[PDB]
Design a protein around this ligand. Structure first.
Ligand SMILES: *[C@@H]1O[C@H](CO)[C@@H](O)[C@H](O)[C@H]1NC(C)=O
Ligand SMILES: *[C@@H]1O[C@H](CO)[C@@H](O)[C@H](O)[C@H]1NC(C)=O
Ligand SMILES: N[C@@]1(C(=O)O)CC[C@H](C(=O)O)C1
Ligand SMILES: N[C@@]1(C(=O)O)CC[C@H](C(=O)O)C1
Lengths: 520, 518
C-alpha cells in the first residue's frame, strides 16, 4: 500500500538506489531491514549531499536534491523503481545522475534502463566484471574495481597455502557466476583443481542449501571451500552448514566480506573463515553524523523507524501488534555501531557525480554559479564524458593525500583493484573480523595472526597422505591427485616420490631416510 | 496524446509509424497512410478475427494498446514506457507487435527485454536484430538485410554495373544495410564511385549536396539506395529540383510505395526497387474499404487520415475550407493493400498461437486464463513462440507455396524478395514485378523499362575502341585506360597487343594476323 522513498528538491537531483530492505521471502517483495549495507549506505548519501550543499567550493549556487529508492535486494524490483527516474525526463523530479546499485544484478539491469535515456550512473559496490563493458553499460561507472582482480587475490591465497583441492559455491547471477568463473581460470593457471562446483540460485529454500552442504561433505579432502556469493545467499549457506554442524574453512568474496550479520547464530561453523573486502578506510566525519541520528531528528528517512525497532528490538507506536516499548535514551554509538566497510565508496560516488556536474557548470555557465539556461537540459552523454575524466582528492573526509586518495576512473569506468584479507576470530569471547593481509598487485599477509578452524592451518589436497614406513607419492595424469605405492622392504625413500634399491650389503633404515650396512 | 486502448483477458501492445517524423520542433507530422494507418488497421483486423475464432484462444479475448511511433526511435521508446509501467488505468502487456523502422524496433527491444516482454516486428529488417545476445525477446516475420544486400549486389553484378554510387540513411537500417551491400559488392568486383549518407534532422541542402556529389561521378549512372522511406522521398525530391537523373536501385525502405515518387515521377522513372516477397490478404481489403469516419471511432487517427487522403475537412480540422462529401469511400480506385500487411497479420497471429499453446499447456481444464497464467512467464513465452509453426492466418490461399509462419533460431523470417521496376506505360506511374530473389537472382529482363529507353551503363571507364585499343588496368580492378596499338600489332586478347611479326600484319578485325604480299 505504501511504497516509501526519499524526495528532496534541488536545482539538480541525484537518484539513489540502496538495498534498504532484504529480499522478500516467497510472495512478499521486501523483507527485513538491511542495517549496515542498507540504512548506513543510505544515510551516507544523505550525509554526502548535506556536506556538498554546505561546500562553497563545490557546486556553490547549485543545491543538490535526491530521489532515493529501495531496491529490496532484487534486480527486478530495482528495475521497476528506476522507471521513476526516466519518467522524470518527460511531482516527478528530473534526474541528473543515479548513485547506486549494491548488488551487481541490480546495477546491471538498472544500467540497461538508464543508458536508454542517457542517465549517468555510479555504483559504490557492484564489482561484476561484466560492468566494465562500455558497449553494453556505456553510462555506467563505479568507485570500485571489477572482480577480475578479486578472483586473483582469492586464487593467490589458495596457491599460497598450497590448497590444491577445493570446492566452490557461487550464487546464480552476474556476481557469483562471472566471479567464480574468473576464480576457476585463475585456479587452473596456479595448478588448483576443483573438487565440486556448486551453485545456489534465485528463490532458493533451506533444502537447496542443505543439498549443497551434503555435496560439499561428499568431498572430504576438499576442506577449503571458495565462495563467491551474494550477502543473503552466504547467510543461507552458513545457516545450512550450522544445522548439520558441518565445518569447512571458508574463503569468501566481498559478498560475505566482513559482515557480522552473516555469521550471527552460526559463529562456530564460520570460525576461522577467510574473507575479502575492498580496501577502504572509514570516513570519520560520517561516524559523527550517523551516531547523532535518532527517530526524533531523522524524519526524512522513512525507513529509519523500522531500522530503529529492529536494531534495538523495539516498538513505539509505529510498529506491528507487539510488545516492549523502547527506551527514549537509546542511541547509535561506539558500543553498537561500526562503520560499514564500503561507506567510503558511497561518499566518493556521490562526490564524483557532484564534481562532474560542477566542472560542467563551470564550463557551460561562465558568468554565474547558478544553473544557467545552457544547463537547463543536461546532455547526459557529455556529462558521462566529463565524468570519466574526473580526478579529485577524496571528499575532505580522507586524511593525507599521499596514500593515493584520488578518485578517478579507468577507461572502462572502474576503480582501483585493492583488497584486504580478513579472518573471522573470537579470541575475546566475541566474534569479529581481523585484517590478516591485503592484495594490491601481489598478495601479502602475516600468517602468524591468522586463527584457523580447528587450531591448525588447513590441508586441502585431493588424495590421502602416504604412509611413512614405506609409501611413495605417485602423480598420475593431473597435478592434484596421487597414489601411494608401498615400497619393497629393501628400498628406501630417496625422496617423497621415489623408491630406490639400497643396493647389495645395505638395507633401509626403519626411517627409510637412508641405507645401513647389513651384518652377518 | 492519442492511443488505442481496448481491454481484454490478455493485451498486446502495438507500434506503428502512424505519423511521419515531425519537422524541426514538432515531434509528429503528416499521416503515413499506407505504412501507418493500413498496418494499424491490419492489427485491429487480426485481433477482431482472432476474437471471433473458436479454435484460437477461445475464451481468452485479446485487447490492445496501440501507440504511434511518429517514425522516431526516441519517440517510440518513450511511448513504450507505457507498456512496462503496466507490469507494476495501465494495461498489462503480454507481448508487443511492432516497430516498422529498425531503429525504433531496436530501441524498443532494448527496453522490452528488461521486463521480459516478447516483441514481434512485421517489417524491421536490420541484421542487428538477429543478435539474440542483445535482442533476446525480439522476433520478426521478415528476414534480415543480410539477404537483401546480396539480392541488390547480384542485380548489379548481373547487368555488369561495376561502377556505382551509394547513399545510405544514418541509422541501424541504412548503415548496416549499406555496409552489407559494400561487402557483397567487393566480392563481385563492383566498385563504389562515392559513398554518400544522409542523417537525422536533415534539410533540403543536405540532400541537394548529395545530388551534387553524385553528379560529380558521371560514369556512375547507377545509384544504390539503402534509405528510410522518408529519406528516400527527400532524395528523389532533391534530384527532381536540379532535374538530375540516375537509375536507382533501392531497398524496401523505398519499396513499392508510390508516395515516394509522387511529384518527381520522371526523375525516378526506370528505378529498380526491392520489397519483401508477399501476397495480399484478401479479407483485409474488405475490412479496410468498409471503414469510414462514421463507423471507425476506435481509431483516433482515422479522421486526420480521412482528411488528408481526400483533402477534406468536416468540423474536426484546422481553420480551413472545402467540407467533404459524405459519399467518399476507400475503394478499388484509390486504395491498394500495402505491401507488408501480410507480415502484420502473421505477427499478431504468431503471438496469438503462442499464447494459445501456452494456455492449453498451463490451463488444461478450461479455455480461460487460469491462475497459473495470471502472471505470464515472458521468457518461457518467447521460447514457446520461437518454436511456433502454423499455417498463415486463414487469409492465405493454398498451403503448398510454403505459407507457414515460423522463426529461425535467431527469430527471423525467410529471405524472399521481389524486384520491382517503376514504369509509366499507361500514362500513370506504377511498380511492375520484374523478378525475384530466393537464393539466386531471377528476373525477365525483357519486361524492364529503363531510364532513357536503354539498359544503363555504369562502369568506371569508357570502353576501348576496337580497331586498335587494348584494355589496361592501373592500380584498381574497376578503372582502366585504352592504349591504341601499333598498326602492325593485333589484340591477342582484350588487354594485350602483340607484334604480328615480320611478313605479317593484323587482320581488319585485329583478332589475328595475315601474310603480307609483294
Ligand atoms: C607450499 O609448498 C611449498 C613447496 O613444498 C613450501 O615451500 C611452502 O612452505 C608451502 N606453503 C605452506 C605455508 O604450506
Ligand atoms: C556483362 O553483362 C551482360 C549483360 O547481362 C552479359 O551479357 C555479359 O555476359 C556480361 N559480361 C561479363 C563482364 O561477365
Ligand atoms: N560487490 C557486490 C556485488 O554484488 O557486486 C557484492 C557485495 C557488495 C556489497 O553490496 O557490499 C556488492
Ligand atoms: N525494413 C524497414 C526497416 O527500417 O527495417 C525499411 C522499410 C520497412 C517498412 O517500414 O516497410 C521497414
Amino acid at each position: 500500500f505504501m511504497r516509501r522513498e526519499i524526495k528532496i528538491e534541488g536545482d539538480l537531483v541525484l537518484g539513489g538506489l540502496f538495498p534498504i530492505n532484504e529480499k522478500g521471502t516467497g510472495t512478499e517483495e521486501c523483507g527485513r531491514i538491511n542495517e549496515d549495507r542498507g540504512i548506513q549506505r543510505l544515510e551516507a548519501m544523505l550525509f554526502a549531499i548535506d556536506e556538498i550543499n554546505k561546500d562553497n567550493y563545490l557546486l556553490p549556487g547549485v543545491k543538490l536534491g535526491v530521489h532515493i529508492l529501495d531496491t529490496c535486494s532484487r534486480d527486478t524490483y530495482a528495475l521497476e523503481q528506476s522507471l521513476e527516474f526516466v519518467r522524470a525526463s518527460l511531482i516527478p523530479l528530473l534526474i541528473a545522475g543515479v548513485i547506486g546499485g549494491s548488488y551487481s544484478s541490480v546495477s546491471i539491469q538498472v544500467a540497461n534502463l538508464l543508458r536508454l535515456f542517457q542517465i549517468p550512473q555510479i555504483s559504490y559496490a557492484s564489482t561484476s566484471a561484466k560492468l566494465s563493458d562500455k558497449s553494453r553499460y556505456d553510462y555506467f561507472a563505479r568507485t570500485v574495481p571489477p572482480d577480475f582482480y578479486q578472483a586473483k587475490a582469492m586464487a593467490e591465497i589458495l596457491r599460497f597455502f598450497n590448497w590444491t583441492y577445493v570446492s566452490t559455491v557461487a550464487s546464480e547471477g552476474d556476481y557469483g557466476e562471472t566471479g567464480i568463473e574468473a576464480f576457476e581460470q585463475e585456479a587452473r593457471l596456479r595448478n588448483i583443481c576443483i573438487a565440486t562446483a556448486e551453485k545456489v540460485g534465485r528463490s532458493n529454500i533451506r533444502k537447496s542449501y542443505d543439498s549443497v552442504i551434503r555435496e560439499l561433505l561428499q568431498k572430504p579432502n576438499a576442506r577449503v571451500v571458495v565462495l563467491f556469493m551474494r550477502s543473503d545467499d552466504s547467510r543461507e549457506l552458513i545457516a545450512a552448514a550450522n544445522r548439520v554442524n558441518a565445518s569447512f574453512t571458508w574463503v569468501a568474496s566481498d559478498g560475505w566480506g566482513a559482515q557480522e550479520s552473516i555469521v550471527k547464530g552460526s559463529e562456530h561453523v564460520a570460525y576461522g573463515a577467510i574473507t575479502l573486502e575492498l580496501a577502504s578506510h572509514p570516513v570519520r566525519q560520517f561516524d559523527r553524523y550517523f551516531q547523532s541520528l535518532n527517530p526524533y531528528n531523522n524524519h526524512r528517512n522513512p525507513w529509519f523507524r523500522d531500522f530503529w525497532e529492529q536494531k534495538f528490538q523495539c516498538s513505539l507506536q509505529n510498529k506491528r501488534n507487539h510488545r516492549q516499548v523502547c527506551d527514549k535514551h537509546l542511541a547509535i554509538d561506539s558500543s553498537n555501531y561500526e562503520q560499514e566497510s564500503k561507506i567510503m565508496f558511497v561518499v566518493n560516488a556521490v562526490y564524483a557525480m557532484a564534481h562532474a556536474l560542477h566542472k560542467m557548470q563551470r564550463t557551460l555557465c561562465p558568468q554565474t554559479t547558478k544553473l544557467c539556461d545552457a544547463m537547463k537540459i543536461l546532455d547526459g552523454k557529455k556529462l558521462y564524458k566529463e565524468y570519466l575524466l574526473k580526478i579529485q582528492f577524496t571528499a575532505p573526509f580522507n586524511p593525507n593525500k599521499g596514500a593515493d586518495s584520488i578518485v578517478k576512473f579507468d577507461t572502462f569506468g572502474d576503480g582501483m583493484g585493492r583488497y584486504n584479507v580478513f579472518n573471522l576470530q573470537q579470541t575475546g569471547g566475541k566474534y569479529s573480523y581481523l585484517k590478516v593481509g591485503h592484495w594490491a598487485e601481489t598478495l601479502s599477509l602475516d600468517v602468524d595472526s591468522i586463527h584457523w578452524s580447528r587450531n591448525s592451518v588447513p590441508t586441502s589436497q585431493c588424495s590421502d597422505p602416504c604412509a611413512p614406513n614405506e609409501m611413495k607419492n605417485m602423480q598420475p595424469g593431473d597435478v592434484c591427485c596421487w597414489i601411494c605405492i608401498p615400497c619393497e622392504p629393501y628400498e628406501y625413500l630417496v625422496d617423497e616420490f621415489t623408491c630406490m634399491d639400497c643396493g647389495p650389503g645395505q638395507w633401509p633404515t626403519a626411517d627409510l631416510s637412508g641405507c645401513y650396512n647389513l651384518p652377518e
